């Protein structure tokens, strides 16, 4: 019994965080086999942030301008290339603490664990949803870029996020580990702003359930559209309660009228996926 926001054990990812420096610009890197992955704006300077040409900036640089500290051990960089918004630095040593892993681009709604790093040192771990507007509500200061979001299924570490930047609102954008951004964001200090935020419908359902264990008026209230593959996923959780998916979908309306605590919260919580409930609750 008990239901809490819960990150994956960060151990297998901490083994992979190095430090990456180009000239005087520094941030975190992800050392896997003989390849360091890092946001590509490490090749920028303070004078150089507004409208940067990463392809000219990159051409000017050699292997020897990429400094990677992995603990004491300085890794010698023996190759460099750029895939969208991430650098790839080939190095002399494969990471001996490399876990089973694969990159994946997660959907909005889905959650991962964030290992906040600074100078290549894991500092803290928390649980994040990819919001509809393709932002996250993080805690990230200067030096935090190159910080990774991941999920652990088996002891396959599925990396789904690398961090780059914060927006004026107080929220955060980044890429999958192919350097492709979430949403329509770019790595430069021009005025960008997020889409307006919906609420993840399936996640507020999943959470409603979790309370017990301890249609589509949603356009009106800014709840994303619920789908068939969502009520097939939610299936296990409607079976466990006896309260069918549609049954639970009912309770939804007298709530968004005049809905003091539920599992501690006086708001519908949407930062928990149904898998995140199954794991914790009956799992």
């Amino acid at each position: 019994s008990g239901f809490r926001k819960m990150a994956f054990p960060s151990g297998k990812v901490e083994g992979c965080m190095v430090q990456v420096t180009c000239g005087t610009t520094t941030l975190n890197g992800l050392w896997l086999d003989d390849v360091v992955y890092c946001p590509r704006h490490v090749i920028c300077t303070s004078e150089d942030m507004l409208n940067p040409n990463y392809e000219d900036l990159l051409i000017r640089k050699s292997n020897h301008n990429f400094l990677v500290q992995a603990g004491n051990v300085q890794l010698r960089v023996i190759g460099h290339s750029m895939q969208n918004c991430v650098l790839k630095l080939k190095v002399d040593t494969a990471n001996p603490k490399t876990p089973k892993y694969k990159f994946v681009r997660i959907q909005p709604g889905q959650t991962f664990s964030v290992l906040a790093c600074y100078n290549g040192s894991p500092s803290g771990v928390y649980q994040c949803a990819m919001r509809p507007n393709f932002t996250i509500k993080g805690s990230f200061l200067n030096g935090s870029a190159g910080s990774v979001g991941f999920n652990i299924d088996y002891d396959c570490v599925s990396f789904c996020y690398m961090h780059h930047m914060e927006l004026p609102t107080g929220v955060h954008a980044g890429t999958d580990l192919e350097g492709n951004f979430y949403g329509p964001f770019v790595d430069r200090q021009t005025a960008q702003a997020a889409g307006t935020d919906t609420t993840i419908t399936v996640n507020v359902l999943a959470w409603l359930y979790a309370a017990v264990i301890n249609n589509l008026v949603a356009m009106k209230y800014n709840y994303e559209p619920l789908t068939q593959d969502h009520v097939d996923i939610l299936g296990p959780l409607s079976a466990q309660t006896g309260i069918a998916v549609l049954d639970m979908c009912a309770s939804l309306k007298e709530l968004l009228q005049n809905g003091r605590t539920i599992l501690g919260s006086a708001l519908l919580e949407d930062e928990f996926t149904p898998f995140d409930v199954v794991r914790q609750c009956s799992g």
């Binding site: 610009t25 941030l27 946001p39 704006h41 200067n142 004026p168 200090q189």
Partner: peptide, 8 residues
Amino acid sequence: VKLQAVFR
């Protein structure tokens, strides 16, 4: 709109 590396 801040890039969250450390610049010096």
